[PDB]
Design an enzyme around this catalytic site. Structure first.
Site, PDB file in Angstrom:
ATOM      1  N   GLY A 183      -6.852  -0.727 -44.082  1.00 54.19           N
ATOM      2  CA  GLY A 183      -8.161  -1.152 -44.639  1.00 54.19           C
ATOM      3  C   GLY A 183      -9.267  -0.560 -43.780  1.00 54.19           C
ATOM      4  O   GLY A 183     -10.407  -0.462 -44.213  1.00 54.19           O
ATOM      5  N   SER A 225      -8.852   2.456 -42.420  1.00 51.86           N
ATOM      6  CA  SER A 225      -8.667   3.925 -42.685  1.00 51.86           C
ATOM      7  C   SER A 225      -9.990   4.641 -43.048  1.00 51.86           C
ATOM      8  O   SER A 225     -10.746   4.123 -43.836  1.00 51.86           O
ATOM      9  CB  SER A 225      -7.741   4.182 -43.893  1.00 51.86           C
ATOM     10  OG  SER A 225      -6.497   3.580 -43.575  1.00 51.86           O
TER      11      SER A 225
HETATM   12  N1  LIG Z   1      -2.329   0.555 -36.088  1.00 57.82           N
HETATM   13  C1  LIG Z   1      -3.289   1.305 -36.528  1.00 57.82           C
HETATM   14  N2  LIG Z   1      -4.286   1.720 -35.802  1.00 57.82           N
HETATM   15  C2  LIG Z   1      -3.251   1.676 -37.858  1.00 57.82           C
HETATM   16  C3  LIG Z   1      -4.154   2.280 -38.720  1.00 57.82           C
HETATM   17  C4  LIG Z   1      -3.637   2.476 -39.981  1.00 57.82           C
HETATM   18  C5  LIG Z   1      -4.328   3.067 -41.011  1.00 57.82           C
HETATM   19  C6  LIG Z   1      -3.674   3.207 -42.221  1.00 57.82           C
HETATM   20  C7  LIG Z   1      -2.356   2.746 -42.350  1.00 57.82           C
HETATM   21  N3  LIG Z   1      -1.679   2.173 -41.360  1.00 57.82           N
HETATM   22  C8  LIG Z   1      -2.327   2.055 -40.218  1.00 57.82           C
HETATM   23  S1  LIG Z   1      -1.725   1.359 -38.689  1.00 57.82           S
END
Ligand SMILES: NC(=[NH2+])c1cc2cccnc2s1
Ligand SMILES: [Ca+2]
Length: 223
Positions: free
Chosen positions: A175, A177
Site C-alpha cells: 500500500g 508502493s
Molecule cells: N517490507 C517492505 N518494505 C515492503 C514493501 C512492499 C511493497 C510492495 C509489496 N510488498 C512489500 S514488503
C-alpha cells in the site's frame, strides 16, 4: 507503514495517492505536470490525488487530476524488480501552494547512515492488516549495501538500496508502493519491495533514484 506516526495533514506536500476507484499506490510530485512512482504500480486509468491527508474524506485541500500518459522504465524487469520506476504526466498542471509542493531530484546519491522520511497509506501491521485513512510517516536510515545483500543474496542490484532497521519493528509495507524516501531534501528512493513487513533482518528495498535522474529529465522534456 509499520511502527510509524501520523504525519500531520499536508506536512508531506509532495506525496501523491494514485487512485483507480480506490487508493493502490503512492507517488511523488516532481513538478506541476509530472509524478514519479514505481513501475510495479502501473495501471491504465489512473487519477492522481494531490493535497490529501485522509483519503476517504474531502477535507478541502485536494486536487484530483487524471493522468494523460504513463511511462514505465525501458528496462523494468517485473520478475526481479530491477529498474522499478515510472513517470506519470498529468492532464492539467497542478496548482502548487503550501499544501501541494514538488520535491527535488538528487544531484548525488546518499550515503549509508543518512536518515530519510518514508510516507504512505499502506498497511500498519506486520502480522495482520489495518489500512490507515491518514498519511503515516517513518524516519529510517539507509543501510550499508553489505547488510542489504546479506539479507537478500543474489537479489540486490546497483539500482536498489535498503533502508530501515534489522531488528524489525519499523518499515514500509504493501500500500506504500511507489511512495517517496526523502533524504536531505531530495527524493532518493521509491518504495519497491521487501519480505513481509518489519521482520527482523528483512529491511525494505527501494529504487535508487540518483541512478535515474538523466532518464527522468530527458523523458519529461520530450513528453
Ligand atoms: N517490507 C517492505 N518494505 C515492503 C514493501 C512492499 C511493497 C510492495 C509489496 N510488498 C512489500 S514488503
Ligand atoms: Ca481527503
Amino acid at each position: 507503514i509499520v511502527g510509524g506516526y501520523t504525519c500531520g495533514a499536508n506536512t508531506v506536500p509532495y506525496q501523491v495517492s494514485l487512485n483507480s476507484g480506490y487508493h493502490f499506490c503512492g507517488g511523488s510530485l516532481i513538478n506541476s505536470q509530472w509524478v514519479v512512482s514505481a513501475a510495479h504500480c502501473y495501471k491504465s486509468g489512473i487519477q492522481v490525488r494531490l493535497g490529501e491527508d485522509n483519503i476517504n474524506v474531502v477535507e478541502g485541500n485536494e486536487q484530483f487530476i487524471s493522468a494523460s500518459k504513463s511511462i514505465v522504465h525501458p528496462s523494468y524487469n517485473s520478475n526481479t524488480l530491477n529498474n522499478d520506476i515510472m513517470l506519470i504526466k498529468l492532464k492539467s498542471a497542478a496548482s502548487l501552494n503550501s499544501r501541494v509542493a514538488s520535491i527535488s531530484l538528487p544531484t548525488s546519491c546518499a550515503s549509508a547512515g543518512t536518515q530519510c522520511l518514508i510516507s504512505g497509506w499502506g498497511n500498519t501491521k506486520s502480522s495482520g492488516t489495518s489500512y490507515p485513512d491518514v498519511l503515516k510517516c517513518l524516519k529510517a536510515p539507509i543501510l550499508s549495501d553489505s547488510s542489504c545483500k546479506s539479507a537478500y543474496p543474489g537479489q540486490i542490484t546497483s539500482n536498489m538500496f535498503c533502508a530501515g532497521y534489522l531488528e524489525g519493528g519499523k518499515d514500509s509495507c504493501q500500500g506504500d508502493s511507489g511512495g517517496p524516501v526523502v533524504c536531505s531534501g531530495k527524493l532518493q528512493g521509491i518504495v519497491s519491495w521487501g519480505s513481509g513487513c518489519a521482520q527482523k533482518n528483512k529491511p525494505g528495498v527501494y529504487t535508487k533514484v540518483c541512478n535515474y535522474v538523466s532518464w527522468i529529465k530527458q523523458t519529461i522534456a520530450s513528453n
